[PDB]
Amino acid sequence: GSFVHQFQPFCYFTNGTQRIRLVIRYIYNREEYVRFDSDVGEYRAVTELGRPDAEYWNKQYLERTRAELDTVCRHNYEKTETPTSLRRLEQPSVVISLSRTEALNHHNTLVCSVTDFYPAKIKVRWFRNGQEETVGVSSTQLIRNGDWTFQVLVMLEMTPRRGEVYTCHVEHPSLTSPITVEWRA
Amino acid sequence: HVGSYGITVYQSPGDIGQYTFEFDGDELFYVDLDKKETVWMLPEFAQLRRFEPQGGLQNIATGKHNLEILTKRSNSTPATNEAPQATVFPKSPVLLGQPNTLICFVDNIFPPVINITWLRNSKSVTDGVYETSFFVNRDYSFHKLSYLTFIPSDDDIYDCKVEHWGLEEPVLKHWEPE
């Protein structure tokens, strides 16, 4: 049928530009044949298909490639990611809803929907009458909406009794103070 | 953090190519090979940073070049078709009457050719639809997301239709509010 070629570059940053690693993958369909890994220092053949390339590139493009760690990785991070990606702050919306139709003293589940936030770092906690809940809390993975915002659903297994106050507590960099939402039976 | 400055994918036959920049897993932009422009997902970013599309074109031309060379090297080993798997979920919490966006996340795509469309009450939708480029996966397959703007109501039910060579028949992922 068809044939595919993929070229995938990766600039891995740690502690800002304190540690930058550059990995470049050359792939045929789904087989990576030759890879440049700055931790290694030169191109390498992953499979036989890469020998015709590794050999030659280490002679004519080694230094050019190594320099991209500064000319591309660091340059992009400091000069373009800095004023855009790294400055993006989107506050999470938090709302609680009950899974099953209410009926006091009957087991149920509270769903805290924390949505539309960026970046990914976030902390979501459940409290019941001022005490933090742990064992009965479950969560989805961090969901990437694909539009530069995430969402996550945190559930609490509970039994609504009169007078109780259930609180979903969210902490995020875009927030000076935590966002809390209460639900009373 | 992780920046992928120049993901370049080329496919034959058809002369299908894609050039994108991803940061922390999100799409910074893709270069429209035909119009020869850098298309930023967040339009405001194009005000604080810029990329010359030529770099995109050039990298694609090279992708094309390395495809012939590699196709010959494998003795023309065609790409295996995979079965794409779709998941539908709302962007915001569902509220009767409140404008929202349904998201169709399709993973394990390979090769990078697919049709992702929407059906509302079993009929095809045209307006309010947008789609991302293919994102790379650790296993070298791709993922893609489609978007449908909509208002939650009692009568409307939806489907994300995925048509791919690895699927005997277009698959429908059903979704309806509560």
Partner: peptide
């Protein structure tokens, strides 16, 4: 203004 660059995919050798 703010110029963005990418990585440069390199060509591969032939024959031999």
């Amino acid at each position: 203004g703010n110029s963005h660059r990418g990585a440069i995919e390199w060509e591969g050798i032939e024959s031999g």
